[PDB]
Each structure stands twice: as C-alpha cells, then as structure tokens.
Design a binder for this molecule. Structure first.
Ligand SMILES: [Cl-]
Ligand SMILES: [Cl-]
Ligand SMILES: [Cl-]
Lengths: 421, 170, 170, 421, 170, 421
C-alpha cells in the first residue's frame, strides 16, 4: 500500500514538520505547578547560544553530517545548526477555580535527505534541527489516583506540530554547473565543452522573452532534464544577461532519466526565472550540442512535456514503450510513424493504451511545412487505461500522442501501440 | 511493601518530575508583597545549582547510576550546561500581606534490584528540574502551620510515576 | 514592465521595510502552544545575523552598493553593531493547538540603471531589519497549505516603497 | 515570665522567619512614585551574584561564622551564603484614581544557632541569610503635611514576614559517629570500641522491622539518649542494611543527660528511618556494651520514654528524684522497689506526687516470668501535681510509674515517693 | 528660618528618598509613544551612575560625610556595587501622543552644625536611589509649560524627612 | 519678520526638544506587523552601551565637539554623550478586529549652542544627544494600493516630541572667576586684583540678608552685568560665608554691555542664592573697585534695573541715548540733570519719548539728604512710544526715569530727552 513516488532521479530535502520531541521525556525542560490566580513562566533566554541537533544516516561516507547540512543550506538556506539567538518563552496564568500544570519540552524541526534513484530511496539521512519548544498545559494532578508502572517506549520521535511535507530538489554537488552568460532569444546552440567530458552536468541559463521552447541534443540523444531554480529572478537583473544567484534549490519540470531514450523537451520558460538543464552521463566520445529554439507555432501545444521519438515501429503487431511516469496532471508525449509507404491511401488500424496508469490523451497529426511543424488535433479525451477503442491512421504518416496522467498507479508508464493490417 | 510484579534483575526507573526535598524548603528565601502589588520570583538553572544529588548502594555506585540513567532517559550532563530560567507571579489582595517562597524541584531516578517480586536494593538520583513557589496570606502575629514552612520527608507535588527499563549485563 | 518615468543614469532606491525571503521561512524554528498558554518568540539583531545579503551586477559591485546606500540612507554597518531585540506573543485558545514560527524581515535596497525610460540593470541589497511571526491553529492530522510554510518568491509583508535618489559621477 | 525550654542538651538551629529588615532604612532599595494609570517595577536581575549576609555571635571561637554556616547546612541544607541566582521583582499598577508609591527593601531570613545546656543557652549566634525582598505600597504623599523631626531608632531588625519558629537539632561535630552497618532484628549487642574512649559519641543504626525496642548500657549505666535523623530512609535502601545519608538534622526522642542516672530506653522504631544513639562522657575505664532488644510483650506500654531505675528506696519516709522534665505530651517512667521483705502479705502506704509540673500517671505492677516482663495496670489517670491520694502496695514488689507531662511549669520534674509503715 | 530645637553640636540627617536635582531633568532622554502603544523606560543602578554627589563645608569634608552617613544609615559604597534595575510603563490613549522622560532620584543626607537653636553650617550628600518619569499628552505645536521640562531648584517628589543622630567626638 | 532676541552678550545653551529623527528613515529601528489579538515588542536592552550623538558646528576651532559637550554639562549637567544605560521598549497589542503595525525610530534631544553678540548669533553649534525613541503605530497596509515613486527629502530633522525651548546662559570659560569668600552685609568694597588685568572676569558672591543692593564701579565706570547662578544655595551652607557649588548655569538679571556707559545696578538679592558679576574689558591701567551697598531707602524703587548716568545734557534741544533694550516686563533707568543753574524758580519744558519700543515710564525727582537719596514720584504711567506729552521741570535738578518695556520691537531702546526754553 506504498505511495508511488514519481520523483525524478536525484537529491531531495524534505521538511517533515516542526515540534518533534523524543520519547521517554528525553527533551522535557520541565514542569511548573501554578496555583490558581498565579502565573508561571518557562524561559529560554539564550545566555548561551549552544544547541544540540540530532543526526542519523544510512551512509556515513556520502551523506555525512557536513554534507547533509550543506544540503539543508542548499534547500532551505539554514545556516545555524549548532547555535541559536532565538528566544522562546511560555507563560501561563491559572484560572481562579483550579490549579494548572505546564510542561515544556525542547523541540526539533525534522528534515529528511534522500537520494532517489529509479524508483526507490538509495541513501537516507534524518537531520533534527533544534527548534522553539512545545508547551502543554494540563489540570493539576489529583491525589493520588495510584501510580501505575509502565515500560519505556521504543526510541523515536513524536510530532506535536502541524502536518507538513515540503519537498525541495537540490543540485547534486558532485556535478559541474556550466553557464550560458547570454540570455536566449529565438535560437541558441550550446557546444558541449571538454572541461566536462563524460560526467553528467548542469547548464544554467535564462531567457529573454517568456515563451515556449524546444530543447534537445543532436539527433535527440541523449535525453535531457530541465529544472527551474526556485525563487530566481526576484533580485538582481541585467537586460539580456544571466544573473547567477547561486540557487541550488530546484523544481523538476520534465525529462527522462534513461539517456539512451531519444527525446526532446517542450517547455514554457519565463524571462524572470533561471533554469538548469541536466545532461546525463554519455558513453560516447563524439561531440554534441544542446539546441534551444523558441516555438511560435503548433508545437506550443506540447508544453510542458518530453517527447519520445519512437523509431522501431516498422512492423505490424504489438509494440510497447516503458518510461518513468509523470506525476498526476503532468505530461508525457510520444512521436511515432505508422509503418508502411506513405501513398495517402493505404491505412492501418491503431490501438493506443496504457497498462496501469490512467491518462487522458490527445492525438495529433504532424505535417512539416516550410513554415515549421503543423499539428492537427484528430482525437481528444482518449482514456488510455486498458483502452479498447481503435482508430485508422495513414501508413507512413507521423503522429504525436500527448498524455496527461490522471491516476498514478505505477512508477512507470507503459504505452502500447498495437497495429493491425 | 516493596513488592513489585517484575522479573529478577536490575532496573532503571524514572519516578517523575515535581519532587521536592526534605528540610530544604526555605533556603532560597522569599518575598513579602502587600496591598495590590505583584511579586515575581525566579531562578536560572546553570552549573552549580544544577549539580545533581546521588545516593548510591553497594551494587549501584554513582557512575553506574549516571550511565544507565543517561543512556535510557535524559542526558542531564549535556542539558544542564544550557541555562533555562523560570518564574512565578503572585498578587497581593488589597489591605493584606502575602508571603511567597521558592524551592527547587527535581526529577527522581532510581536503580532497583528485584529478587522474587521484591525490591531488595534501591539507589536514588535527584536531578534538578525547575522550581515551585508556596504562598500564604498572613496577619501580624498570626500563627502559621509548621507544614507550610518545613517538609519532613521528600514528596512529589505532582503525580508520581514509574517508568522502568531492565538493565542487561556487560 | 521595467519601465520608469525617470531620466537616464544611476539611482539608489529604498524599497521599504518588511521584506521576507524565499525558502528561508522556517529555518529559525517555531513553538507549539496549547490550551490557554501564551507563547513568546523573539530575537536579537547583532553581528552574525545582521550580516546583509548582496546581489551585485557588472556595473554595481558590492562596494558601490554599500557606499551609495549608506551615504543616502541608513548606515547599516554602524547601526547593526548595537543589539536590538524584538518579540511576538500569541495565545492559544482553550482546547486547541497553535503553531507559531519566526522569520527575519529585511529592508530592500536597489541600484538601478535607467536608459530611455527603462530599467536595464538592477543590483539588490537586503539589510536585516527585525522579524515576523506566522501562526495557525491546527488539529491532529489536519492538512495545512504549503503556502503557510514555504515562500516561493520574495515578497513584502507591508506596502512596498520606491524612495529614489540619482547618483552623480565621480 | 520566661517560657520553659524543655530542650535536651546540645545544638539547635532555629529558623526565626523571613522578611527581616534593619532599622533606619539601612536595607531600603528605594521608592518609585507611580502616576495613576501607569506601572512601576523594581528589579533584582542578579547581574552580579554577590549577596551580603549578616552575622553576630557570643563566642567567636566556637561559633565562628564558618562553624555557624556549617550548622545551617546541617540543619536546613543551605549552601549559598555569599551568592544567589534567585531573581525577585516587584510590579505595581496604580489605580485610575490616585497616584501610588512603592518602597522596596532587601530582606533577610533570620537563623539562630544555640548551644543549650542544662536549662539555659550557653552559646548563641544569629545568622541573617539574604532573602528575596519586601515591597510595601502606599498612597501618594500629600503636600506637605509638615516634616516632623525624629531621632534614629536603636540598631536592630523588624520582621515583615509571617511568624515562624522552626527548631532543628543538629549533630555535635566534635563527637564521633560510629555505625552499625547491619540492620537490627530481635537482639543486638554493640561493644564499645577503644577508638572512641571517654569522649561522648553517636551510634547510627537502623531497624529491620518496625517495632518497639528496649535499649540500654550494661547495668543501665550510663544513661543514653536517642534521636531520629530527619527525613532519613526516603531514598537509598539495601535490605537488612544501614544506608547512611549523612543527615545531621536530628529530632530528640527521649533520654537523660545525667550520665550517672540508671536508666533504659523504650522506643518505637521504624524500619524506614535511621536513628542516632548518644552515649555520654563516661568516667570509667571498664568495658561497656549497648544492648538492643525487640519488645513483643507488655514493655511496649512504656513507649516512648526513659525508665529511671530507683535504687535507694530501702527505708520508710520521704524520697525524691529530680530529672529533666519531658515536654508536654511526652513521657518519663520510674521503676522502683517497695522496701521490705517480699512475703506477699506485708504492705506499705505509698504516695506518689510531683512538685511543680502537672502529669497524668499510670501505675504498673511488674512481675518477671519465664516469658519476659509482665505489666499489670493497677492505677490509671493519676494526677501527680501535689497529689494527696495514697495507695497500699506490697513490700518487696516492683512497680513502674509512667508519667505524661501535661503542664510544663519547670525545666525539671521532681517525683516524690513517700512511704509510710 | 534655619532654626531647630536641638542641642549644640554636629548631626547626621537623613532627609528622605525621592529628591530630584535642578537643571538635570531631561539629560537621559525620553520616549514619544502614540495611538494605543505602550512605552517602557528603565535604568540600571551600577558603578558610574551610582557615584554620589558631595557638597562639603569647612568643618565637614567628604570623608567625614561618607563615614558618618555610612555608620548611621545605609552603606552606599557596598550597596551600589550590586546592580538594581527599575522601570516605568505608560500607555498612549487612542489618537493622541504621549511624551515620557526619565530622571534619577536621590536620597538626601546632611551634616549640620547647631549652635543656640540655629543651623550655622550644613554639608549635603546626594546618593543615587532609583528614578522617576514625568509624562504629558500633547498636540502638534502645543505650547508646554517650562516647569514640565526644567526644575530650577532641588525638590523632593515625596514627603521630606528629618531623621537625625548626634555625632560624638573622636 | 524675525523675533527680536533681547539676550545679553555671551553664551547660551538651548534645549530645543526631544524626539528628533532624521529624514529618509536614517533612524528607523524597524517595523513589526502584529496580527490581531497578538502583541509585539521592540526592545533596546543596552547589551552594548554605545550611542551615536550627532554634531554640527559653524566654528570648529572655538565650538569644537569637546567644547560644546562641556557647555552642555555646564548648562544641563549632561555627562554621558557616547553611552547610555537607559532602556526603552515599545509594546503593542493589536485589537481583535484588525492587524497593526508599529514603527520604531531612534531619537535625539536637540541642543543648540550660541555665542550671541550685539544683536546676532556669531557662533552656532547643534548637538543631537541620543534619546529614548519614537514609536508610531498604524493600521495594517492594504494590498496593494499602488507603489508611488518619491524622491528623497533634503537632509535634516523632524521633531516628533512636544514643543520645547529652554534657554540657559552659561559662564564663558575663557574668563576668570574671582570669589568674595565673605557674605556681604551692608557695605563691601572689592579691589580689582592684578591677577585679572584688562581681560573681562566674573566675581562670585553671596549676600547675608535678602535685600536690594546698589552695585557699581568707581565713578560708575565701567558698566557691570549681574547674573544669578541657577539652583544655587539649595545645598551646602556656611553662615556668613560663600559656598561655591561650581554652577556655571546663569540667568541674566540686568546690566549693559557697552563698557563706556556710565551706570549702576540696583538689584534684589537673596541670601539663599549666589550671584556672578561680570566686569568687562577695561582699556585703562588705573585701579578700580566694585562697591556693594545695601539700600534701605527710596532707591529700592529702581529694582531691578541698570541706571544710566546721563552727563551731556548741558544745552537745550534734542538729546538721544541708545542702549540694549530690556526684554518685555524688564526695566531700564536713566538719571539725568536738567541743564541750567538751580535757583528753584527757573524751569524748562521736557519731553521724554522712545522711538520704536513701547514702555511704561515713571518719573522721579531725586534730592540727596543726609539720610541718603530721596525719590519723589512726580509722574506715573508714562507711555513712552512716540510720546508727545511734555512736562515742566526745574533747571539744575536731578531726575530718574524708570522704564518698563511692554512691547519689544527693536533690539535697542532709544530714549529721547527733548528740552525747550
Ligand atoms: Cl501504465
Ligand atoms: Cl515537678
Ligand atoms: Cl525705542
């Protein structure tokens, strides 16, 4: 009954909430018994600034405490881990009727650091950052009930703060960040430099004018990913230039992790934002370029998604293609060519369907003119999950299926293109 | 008596917060407030008023007590280095006098040895917690109960507790 | 857009107090108070939490920014050496739980270059000011809006300002 | 018109109350004049921890300030004399109508240290421990009345706190404390060791089972005293063993100071408590033992008191015996033998009475069987003070008079046993 | 006049708490609070604001004054080494402005020489005590009485006193 | 439309009010946005004692910052300029309905130091002493109005405190202070010592009995001025002796600055006060004395003023005399002799009038007896300003005109004595 985590490969820092305390009163500051009418205060005056963060990890050698702290700084900009100048104080006035007790506990804000790879967590750290306390008030205990003996709880935590899950992707520090210092207009070609051979790397760029862009490598290989830097472009600004604010907190927009998958990106980019492109480990010594092109035409219909180029569709029968499934309400697109000679008469019966994930699909006929690519919408509201409906398409013609995931039942999406005749 | 439904062996026991100690009641002094005014007494738990009170036995020496207590429950040596303050406020009613006095509270820990459903040995540790004020309104020359001033035996101003863990052999 | 009815040249701009920064919201931690109690969180602006945030451009380096800002407006280097405290107080309603969290506020300064009624370059400086608390009452397991916890882009919790002065050449 | 102090010989520390101030404004912190509506605070923030205790003594060489402090630590466990981390603060909001003044004074808690010996104080010290202030509020002074000149008061103190007299006996530090490391069951014989020859000393012991015990030296010489250690047995515990908590705060239970007085003790001892026995200066080089015996029989009727063995009752006429009087509601007992040959017929007229103290007496006939001592109650509710009632008793027989003091008019109790025939 | 029903000789005189000094009124500064807010001003009596003011005469030099005052009354040299704080709180009424200013108060001591029911010589010592705030609500441009700002001659804000002791010869 | 400043020559320190802030938010401590129900505090805890006073001057070489501070100490007894132990704190509880903002500013108390000479300021310094803050509360800003751009204000200050102008004269430190150690009774003659030759100086003296005194130099040259030391005589006191309290804060009573003007002083002196006499720069090497004389007679009518001796009235026609005008309600007097032989019959027509200042005048006939000077009031309620009324007086006789200024239109007063016949 596990949730499917449709996260992209890489590092995430997750704020899992405030007001965490340890079991067995390990973080009890103490109790005040306030007689009725009176008041009581418990105070953290910060006469000493020292605090005591708690840290556990699955891998001391990658996710050390140092590394984990650096990641928390990348994600949320935390910078004091051992110290604090922040005062907290709890005050209680007991009502006229009855006495009152207040228990004060120190608290932690829980951060989780994950390395998520191909559908599971492969490295995990928990960092408990010292927080600003928990104060429970209760009625005065009565004499004497009777003291009932109890065994200690297992070691662990209890959250007393409100529910919280804030997920923030972070730039992998072991990978280089190259920069495109000029703002991209209509076209741009980035040659892949020898300073970053073979290893994966990021390209930080910005755009001159808000618009939809097609981004790809030569021959659509390898597949790229694209991130938005969170909160970028709010500050310093130079017209037609990139301003790097050293932001390592990233939102995944789209892109496949399988580098041998032919694909291209179609994304809506803002001029008031910076974006990172991640190019993966390439097993070839051949030169390569990243092409950026502003789309003014029908290709704007494909934002925001990656488009798989399907090449092996040259026989009749059953064909299937597995990719990482987008999250709910996110997109994935496939461009394919119906096998056979294009003579504008010969036709084949095509059945498109998914195996586990439910997705709404729209089908496009693609013709290329001297004005660019043209997309004719020939089918709308296709419900893909185990779809039995078929449609007749032209042999030798080119189509694009755009798929919006609506029910995420599987980490992967499995598209089937069954062809008969 | 000292009978307990547990197996044979040694145990760490957290007996709760809110313990006050005998004879020690008034040694921090107190305030006299009058006629509508408000008195506020307080303290600051650091260093040399946070030094705990050990009461060891032939089996359970001080080091044993400290180590087991700090392993299972709160590590008081690390905690009591970071200052924590507390305060109490009382208001005198018009045309009357109020006296308020302050005393430290402690968490009570125990190391017990159990043999045939019987506690045959017990070591005690008091770790400084916060504080507690008692107040009384008085007239000139009014006799006050000794019990208000002087505690004969340690008691807990809250509900006592018994949170145990069995200690396993080296 | 970035259009402005000013002449050509460089300008210092005070954009007001009350700016909070993206992502940074919860890094100081927060309190959970309950059932009638009062929580009071606070801070003290000195030394190494008063260090400002610079965002320079090819024309306007850090020194330029500092010097012009401190000449025209407040000299933050002299001011931020003298400790100033601030506090917020929230009270939990009976039988409910309240969470309160603290974040620094900043004065936002800008250096802008204007050419033909258009801002073609902008440097930014955030100088630590005071603070700001957000609070929410919650139930066990109640889902809370991400927007309460996490700020995506810098905003001003007050009315923004635009107090300018033209900078003349050396 | 002096109160009789029926204290036993030795050292006492007496808490005489809080809120003491000196005369002539020597301890005035100061005055705030608060206009109506406004508020005013006077604060002791303890930015410096220094305090200034006041000390006077009658004997610099025994009761020095050091010694006196050690005694206060023994009695009440005070340990900070020069310092304090305890804050106090006075706050006043003036009513809407009139202005208000607040005067704040520093205060002291007054301790008295006495050496009480044979009916008077022979050494006396007063230690004023710095306390937590006195705050009097008054109405605003009116212009101008007229300033009336006044001479300064004599040097001294004024108590502004509530009435308090807490008397706590303390172990004399010049005397050794020997220990009986084994818990006493039914019988025990403690040989008196040469390490503590001639000088008085204490024996710290505990009991296995709550019960009444007869304690005495060889031939009931010398007389012993017994104390309970205050608040003992609340903490550490080893079955059948003594746990010494180094408690020097002692409650006198019973016992005579006159060491040449033949006597034995009959006391109710708790298993959850420790007790001290004080054995006095003995002017003999002969060996001696302290005998402890659990009483299961009629001797339980004599708790808690000392029993004087009266030896010189061998003629008819007037016989009188002077001892330190017990306090009100406390006991003293006398065991005597009616002069003459015991032939079960010959009888004498006996008149028992006191001279100044009023006491209720009960008379016992004592016969010893092979089962122990037997006590037959033959007279109840004897009002001793100048009693004229007489009773006929058997020549040669043994009796015990148990006396409860009800009116303490004299430091001594004077028992008269007048015999006629 | 300076006539007194006492014998011939020298005297120490405690003239009471609550004395304020001429010209010195506003030298600590003051607060302006507005529209419902509360202002709280305060001080801390230590070291170099607790240094007393001596005014000796040919007969009574400073040492004489100090020694006699500290023998009979409070020893200010020992006391004024231990910090004591004080505060005042004023609240501005809605839609009005309030100004509040602080000044030290002093105990006034005197050494007097009396000859034939007449004071022919007088030495004065002012020892710092606590403080005192004056407040006023004001309108923009409202003229305020000089007397509110400026004290021409030393006065006592409380009832004056005259607590004397005759000084006997060495 | 400038106010006439009828100040005497010399130095003045002026408290110009509290709650001064600089323009363009240079002294903003900051803003708190308090949600409804909640409270907010801004605190100056003085963890560091440093403060930052602001100083400007017209003349760095006389009125340096050091000098100016010394002057502020002379006037108001300020002594901490760089430091402060005084806490201030602003607290605001927002009402249940709406949110609230509080802005806190640091403030200054503004002092002005002037050197005023012959009708204008010749040296000027402004010293802004750090104060105890300004707190404005406002309603919560609404989204978003719209941000309207504004140019910065000119550099300067804004007063947020109440209106205040407190003017205090101070002793010029470059001039010596001589002392008359004996209290003045009925007569006293002070010889002018060679230790202070040529340069102007002050004489500090006191009086034995409250009364009116005539003070002058030999032959009424040069003119003297007299000041009262502010708050003197409140403290130490020795019968018949001067007690110097080193008070440099002075109130001008009366006296001319023109040293070649024959004059004498008639002033009401208190025994419980000290006074300074200023004797000006004298361009002569001749010895001189200051005469003090207690007036018991009619000369008491001339207090408090200077009396000009008019010598050049020896022809008929127009005669005019210019002096510094007293302030409103202050006095100036003229003693003159009607030209001609005194034969008790010959008479002249006299017209007395002023040119710009309105003054009420009373005329006295002066005859000297062997009992002293006699003053007969012969004319009352003379309205001097452009007076056309004339009066017939005796040739060779001596008169004194006492003038009370009622409307100050000019820095100078111009008296005209027109004589016809
Ligand atoms: Cl699927
Ligand atoms: Cl008796
Ligand atoms: Cl005129």
């Amino acid at each position: 009954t596990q949730r499917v985590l449709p996260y992209s490969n890489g590092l995430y820092v997750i704020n899992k909430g405030d007001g965490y305390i340890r079991t067995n009163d390990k973080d009890l500051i103490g109790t005040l018994l306030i007689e009725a009418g009176s008041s009581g205060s418990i105070i953290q005056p910060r006469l000493r600034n020292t605090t005591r963060p708690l840290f556990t990890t699955s891998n001391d050698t990658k996710f050390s405490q140092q590394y984990t702290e650096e990641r928390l700084k990348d994600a949320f900009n935390v910078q004091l881990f051992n110290t604090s100048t922040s005062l907290f104080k709890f005050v209680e006035e007991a009502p006229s009727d009855k006495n009152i007790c207040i228990k004060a506990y120190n608290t932690y804000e829980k951060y989780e650091l994950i390395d998520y790879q191909n559908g599971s967590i492969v490295n995990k750290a928990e960092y408990y950052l010292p927080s600003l306390g928990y104060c429970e008030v209760t009625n005065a205990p009565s004499p004497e009930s009777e003291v009932v003996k109890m065994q200690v709880a297992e070691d662990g935590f209890i959250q007393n703060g409100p529910e919280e899950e804030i997920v923030v992707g972070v730039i992998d520090p072991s990978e280089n960040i190259q920069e495109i210092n000029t703002a991209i207009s209509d076209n741009y070609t980035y040659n892949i430099p020898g300073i970053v051979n073979n290893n994966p790397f990021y390209i930080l760029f910005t755009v001159n004018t808000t618009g939809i862009y097609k981004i790809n490598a030569q021959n659509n290989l390898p597949s790229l990913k694209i991130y938005e830097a969170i909160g970028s472009g709010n500050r310093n600004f130079q017209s037609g230039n990139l301003c790097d604010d050293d932001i390592k907190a990233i939102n995944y927009i789209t892109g496949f992790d399988s580098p041998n998958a032919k694909s291209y990106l179609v994304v809506l980019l803002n001029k008031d934002k910076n974006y990172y492109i991640r190019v993966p480990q390439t097993s070839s010594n051949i030169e390569n370029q990243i092409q950026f092109k502003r789309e003014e035409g029908d290709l704007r219909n494909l934002m925001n998604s990656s488009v798989n180029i399907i090449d092996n569709l040259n026989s009749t029968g059953a064909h299937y293609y597995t990719r990482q499934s987008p999250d709910v309400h996110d997109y994935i697109s496939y461009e394919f060519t119906i096998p056979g000679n294009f003579n504008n008469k010969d036709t084949s019966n095509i059945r498109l369907y998914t195996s586990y994930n439910q997705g709404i699909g729209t089908l496009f006929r693609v013709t290329e003119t001297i004005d660019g690519y043209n997309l004719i919408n020939i089918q709308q509201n296709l419900h893909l999950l185990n779809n039995t409906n078929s449609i007749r398409l032209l042999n030798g013609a080119i189509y694009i299926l755009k798929v919006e995931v609506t029910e995420l039942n599987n980490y992967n999406i499995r598209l089937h293109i069954d062809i008969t005749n | 008596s000292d009978t307990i439904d547990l197996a044979d062996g040694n145990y760490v026991v957290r007996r709760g917060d809110g313990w006050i100690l005998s004879r020690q009641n008034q040694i921090l002094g107190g305030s006299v407030i009058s006629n509508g005014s408000t008195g506020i007494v307080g303290d600051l738990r650091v260093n040399d008023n946070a030094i705990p009170y050990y009461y060891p036995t032939p089996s359970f020496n001080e080091e044993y007590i400290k180590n087991n207590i700090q392993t299972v429950f709160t590590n008081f040596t690390e905690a009591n280095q970071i200052p924590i303050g507390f305060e109490f406020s009382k208001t005198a009613p018009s045309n009357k006098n109020l006296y308020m006095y302050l005393q430290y509270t402690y968490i009570r820990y125990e190391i017990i040895k159990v043999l045939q459903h019987e506690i045959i040995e017990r070591a005690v540790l008091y770790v400084p917690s916060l504080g507690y004020v008692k107040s009384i309104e008085f007239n000139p020359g009014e006799k006050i109960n000794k019990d208000f001033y002087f505690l004969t035996n340690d008691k807990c101003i809250l509900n006592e507790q018994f949170l145990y863990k069995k200690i396993l052999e080296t």
